Design an enzyme around this catalytic site. Sequence first.
Site, short mmCIF file in Angstrom:
data_model
loop_
_atom_site.label_atom_id
_atom_site.label_comp_id
_atom_site.label_asym_id
_atom_site.label_seq_id
_atom_site.Cartn_x
_atom_site.Cartn_y
_atom_site.Cartn_z
N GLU A 1 1.10 -1.01 -0.21
CA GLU A 1 0.02 -0.34 -0.35
C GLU A 1 1.17 1.40 0.23
O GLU A 1 0.94 2.19 -0.69
CB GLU A 1 -1.45 0.03 1.28
N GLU B 1 -3.67 5.57 -1.13
CA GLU B 1 -2.40 4.27 -0.87
C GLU B 1 -2.26 4.56 0.22
O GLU B 1 -1.59 3.75 1.73
CB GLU B 1 -1.35 4.63 -1.92
N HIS C 1 -4.58 2.70 2.48
CA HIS C 1 -4.58 1.97 2.79
C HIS C 1 -3.39 1.54 3.18
O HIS C 1 -2.84 0.47 4.64
CB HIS C 1 -4.40 1.46 1.04
N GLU D 1 -2.72 -5.55 -8.68
CA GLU D 1 -3.46 -5.07 -8.20
C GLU D 1 -5.12 -5.96 -8.77
O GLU D 1 -5.74 -6.56 -8.16
CB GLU D 1 -4.13 -4.00 -8.40
N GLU E 1 -10.64 -0.11 -4.76
CA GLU E 1 -9.76 -0.70 -5.58
C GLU E 1 -10.27 -0.46 -7.15
O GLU E 1 -9.64 -0.51 -8.36
CB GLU E 1 -9.78 -2.08 -5.38
N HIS F 1 -8.30 1.84 -9.05
CA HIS F 1 -6.51 1.42 -9.69
C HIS F 1 -7.32 0.99 -11.09
O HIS F 1 -5.87 0.59 -11.18
CB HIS F 1 -6.42 0.71 -8.73
FE LIG Z 1 -4.51 -0.29 -1.66
FE LIG Z 2 -4.74 -0.14 -4.56
#
Ligand SMILES: [Fe+3]
Ligand SMILES: [Fe+3]
Lengths: 168, 510, 72, 387, 388
Positions: free
Chosen positions: B97, B127, B130, B192, B226, B229
């Site tokens: 992360e 990020e 996370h 990812e 997510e 991303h």
């Molecule tokens: Fe993440």
């Molecule tokens: Fe991510």
Amino acid sequence: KLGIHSNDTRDAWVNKIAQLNTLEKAAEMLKQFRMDHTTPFRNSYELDNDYLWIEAKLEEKVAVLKARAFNEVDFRHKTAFGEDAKSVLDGTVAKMNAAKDKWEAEKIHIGFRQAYKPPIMPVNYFLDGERQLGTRLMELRNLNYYDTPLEELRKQRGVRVVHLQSPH
Amino acid sequence: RAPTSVNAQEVHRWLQSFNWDFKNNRTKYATKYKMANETKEQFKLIAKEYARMEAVKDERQFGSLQDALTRLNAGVRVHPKWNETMKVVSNFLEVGEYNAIAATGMLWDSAQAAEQKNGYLAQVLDEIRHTHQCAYVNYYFAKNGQDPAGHNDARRTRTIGPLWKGMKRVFSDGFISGDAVECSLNLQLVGEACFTNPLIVAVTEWAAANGDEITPTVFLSIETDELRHMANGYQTVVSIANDPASAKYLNTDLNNAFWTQQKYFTPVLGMLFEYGSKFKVEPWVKTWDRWVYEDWGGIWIGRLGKYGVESPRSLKDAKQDAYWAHHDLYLLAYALWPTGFFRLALPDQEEMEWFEANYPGWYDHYGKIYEEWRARGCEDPSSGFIPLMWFIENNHPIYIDRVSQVPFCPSLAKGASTLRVHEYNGEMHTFSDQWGERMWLAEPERYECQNIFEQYEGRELSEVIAELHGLRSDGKTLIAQPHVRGDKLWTLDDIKRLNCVFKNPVKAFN
Amino acid sequence: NRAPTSVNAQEVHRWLQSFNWDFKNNRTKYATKYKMANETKEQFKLIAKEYARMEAVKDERQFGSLQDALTR
Amino acid sequence: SMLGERRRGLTDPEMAAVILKALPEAPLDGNNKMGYFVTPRWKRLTEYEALTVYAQPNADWIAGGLDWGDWTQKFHGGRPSWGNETTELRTVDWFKHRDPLRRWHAPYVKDKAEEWRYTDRFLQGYSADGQIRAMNPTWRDEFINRYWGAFLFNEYGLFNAHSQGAREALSDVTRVSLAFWGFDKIDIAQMIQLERGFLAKIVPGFDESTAVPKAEWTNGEVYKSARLAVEGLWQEVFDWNESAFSVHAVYDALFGQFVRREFFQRLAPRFGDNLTPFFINQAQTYFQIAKQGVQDLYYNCLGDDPEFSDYNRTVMRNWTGKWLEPTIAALRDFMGLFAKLPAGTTDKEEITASLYRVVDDWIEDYASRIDFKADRDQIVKAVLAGL
Amino acid sequence: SMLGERRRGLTDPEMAAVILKALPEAPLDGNNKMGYFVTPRWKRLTEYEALTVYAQPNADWIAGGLDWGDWTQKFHGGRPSWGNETTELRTVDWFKHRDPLRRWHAPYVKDKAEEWRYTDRFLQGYSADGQIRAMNPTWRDEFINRYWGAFLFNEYGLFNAHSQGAREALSDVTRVSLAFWGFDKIDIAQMIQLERGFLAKIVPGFDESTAVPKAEWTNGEVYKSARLAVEGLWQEVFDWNESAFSVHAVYDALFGQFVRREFFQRLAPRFGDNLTPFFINQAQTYFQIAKQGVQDLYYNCLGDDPEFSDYNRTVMRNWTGKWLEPTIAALRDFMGLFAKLPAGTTDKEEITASLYRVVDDWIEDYASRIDFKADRDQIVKAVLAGLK
Ligand SMILES: [Fe+3]
Ligand SMILES: [Fe+3]
Ligand SMILES: [Ca+2]
Ligand SMILES: [Ca+2]
């Protein structure tokens, strides 16, 4: 005596660095140290476990000395060796673009780092070169990346195959 | 005088025009590609609105944790094996992360279109969200769990073991070191899309099965972020689909990205899932095949075909080496258990039946070894035995792949058993597969990572552990353990008596 | 001096007692046999803004637990 | 089914029993303090520190790291994932920094989300209260749509200047602060556009297109040098600290503070404009928030570093001198905007006084910290040459 | 201990087993919509409606109730807990009202808490940015500390006017709105005092004591009639609707809107004051929020009631005429404050124009809804007479 973060070898170098009191002496030692201990082309792997930490402690000294020796304009535009940063950058990029193959290119890029990595060259020019040189190096390397079979590639790299094992 | 306002999309409409043309308006990072400076992002967000949707998500999450979950004592009523597993899963994910922060900041620099920069920027902040969420999981388990050690200091105790090195490759350096586009494929197009997104959900399933409701609460929140991303990794391919260099370099970087990631997760995730749990959710073989082969290698990679993207050439190899990879790795992880920051356990009987059932041939190989080890007293501190000794006695050297950092024992493995040793300018190098070997040969200066045997060479075990703070608050007992019971924990002394000293397994070819 | 400063609840509540003023029909509209001393003081020095903030923090947890973990 | 298919270990009798049976009588360690080994900046370790410090996997060769060994994968050529080579500044520990506001992700989005939701409420009250009536048309259609609107590109550019820092920052604490400093800048830039979009909904003829303000920014005279300094801070500086330091401790502390506070905040009121000041209030809150962080990193940590105090101050003085000039040029060109104001709006005296405030606050909070000898009369007079 | 002593039915194996064993295969009713029987104001029933409507145990003898029978315990004399006798207004259903903002407790404290926390941030940025320097001393020490400060008692008094409504309101939806309208007024009053306390911390000589502004309110001339109208709305009106209606649809829509917007919001800027306007922004947000609710209750529900539309409009016209006069008197006395301003601050033209804005918006949003024939020239001219 023995330790990962603290050991006799590291203490040895700390003292050697405390003895540098001239920008020229120290700057020279750093460039030499880089030639001797860094990159796959280092003169020897005897300091493999401490070179990274030692090199930083060395850069620290060259940095302080340079700041006290250089004037504002020079600190921004000259290398610790008195060279004109921009000239060196443009010059090295010239040879990189005049690179015939990926083998000549990697030599230019890697040598550039060993010689001009801050505090030798000003970071601005260095990272600028780092972007131009790196781009060319990759263009040459990733072109038909898998065409050369391992047998041949090992030969080009010039490695000494000490052992091979493969049930398939 | 009617009550009116303005929302995100109404402002985002003009965000593309925010960037202007001028001389040095270009990337500061080396790259073989050219990102179209007219690319558009899928989600019309602005800082204010982004903050609001993330904040709403935080309320629930922290509300559940500080309140109901604490009242239910959810931090404790979890299976011991899992409390340990989460020390690794959460902290190891934390750096993924965290490096993804720097990685998407590098991509935001690479992007030229204002909308593509903004797309990456949303991730730059996610990020961070996370990194802090994963951190909170260990924080919560440390404050309220059955064993805080490891959870409370993984950021430093993780440096002792070999599993951490491989983790830094796929989720740290693989995310920020190299061509921006290569990193993007490692992080978004593969990392990812192929593993992280499915994995985060998987982890919540295994967690729930083992009493852990903390992780579900946090990870299901991370999961909601997510889909952005994915769009960023997808838009990276679009921005460079029309560049001529793309038809030459795209598939090579994608293949290297695929292999880099799978090389580590294929054996590590399955190991953590099947061996770090009591209650099972589904066999890793079946899971892997669905993720990597179908959903990604087939469905996700197929949609990007119209951009010149093709299926990774190393896909078959990955699949064939995968089957036994995780089983082969636990043997090494348990054998080197004193180098970790978590407690490991051997398969109980119910588990061995499950393993053999789902992996025919399991018992005759791994099963018997574990029983042999348990018999010599690998779990008892008075036995003076550590599985590492068994590897020495039976001449089964353990090497570290110079590229991926993944530990491997070719003389005992059931999956890949290839071994390539080279010498170049006074240094020896060990490789476990043909792809990693090519990477090194072509880019020797990209992979100079020292392995544990190199660094710990000539060092007595207990000394390396103490030096790197691998002890509990009593300064006596080890953080790591060969069993997950509450009594008979190994102490630094128990390790010192073994008088175990590390050796660089490669020096033998001398 | 441009040091970062603000004002909290009690700092305003200090003057709340003085908010009420005297006048003719300033009295209760409800029948009562008692007379509440018009100088009585409250124990908690709160103001609307601060009251809202402490109740809102409590709501986050509560609804968070209900909509999330408890529903799961 | 009403009960669901998946059985959970916390509530399933059979599974929970197995779990409970395996638990130890008490925790296997009484130290339940995650991050207990971190050196607290304040009396006790804070949640902010525990969740942030040491998240970056640096090795001891990068001042302050706890790991060991080289990175696993590097750039073609050999450049490390993170290295001492990306900045001229040196320190004894890159994890020393601390955001005085102790902002980690959660608190950050919480505060910003509150501002966003209130901003919505505010605009709906404003439009319904019909206050736009009392606003001067020229100020609205001229100075807000064109000049204030053009300033959005200034903030947008300062935002982008942080891109490389986000990638190169040498520690988690610094990376997070940096990330937040820049995220606030893009926010301000978007708030400027939000106001122009709002006016478009209540002022029958106001075009929200960024065309006009963008042309003013790209080809105007008022912001020419401002734009030249911005393009430079953003794309010509490769040192992440020089970028953050020069942007916040030089350019934006002088030029930005003057434009936002000494021009628009000071004059908008005089034209029946209470709208723009609503947003400038946010930008100033953000500015003052970022300043606390900027000071702690460059002055308390680096400028006063017990080992490189001298070295660092030298380098920052160097950077201040390098960027003070382009910043003065930006202010000078900006002076040209006062000639556009209706007569009697303000005089050379007010303008000079406000300039002295900006310069004195700058010498106050920044220049004096690194012992940069600044001459207030000189600076102001140089800018004054612009009227 | 680590596991705790108390065993819980959700996690305790033995107890949970007993519980699971007694559960039915499926819900004993598929209608899982609490409040399903409520008539939705919008397309679908809202959380606000479900959690609010019918919480008040009214019997059918109080328009709209669902219960039956008398209250269980009443006042000495026989007065009911709640009854039709507490207001002159009549309707077909007291639960018809709906706050357009759909505010129930949670959302209400959420929004206010956000404003509070930002207010904190704002002040800390303001003090650190040193903006107080550019503010005129006279405006600060004179018009803010004394006159704006005095206005706090005006808002405080309007707040108290809601006390009886809080108790007599004939339905939950109305009670909640009423409660919130008044809670916002006390908040504004406290925000006025917060500004004076803030200035005391950054202006070396500013006394935050409420003594000066209170004396101005109790014995001044500027707010004399304003205070007389406030004391009246608060303590002389026993009808909860007349109170809410007159306060919001007459007095505060004219006097309050003029003072807050046409005087302080309009002039503070001209004196280097960006502080006061920060707070007035909140008060105006609150005012516009309350107006939506006030309109829905008195105009959409009562004024347009399918059975008492006529009756109700008559009564509200009566109340408007009853309070329009005292409100005009309050505005008139307030005109006296302009003579205190430094010369050239504003002229009779700006003042007249701003008054016309307040009166036109009032005729706009309130008077015309109940067909109250209002003459703008007359009202303004009557107030204008107060200019010294
Ligand atoms: Fe993440
Ligand atoms: Fe991510
Ligand atoms: Ca009088
Ligand atoms: Ca006039």
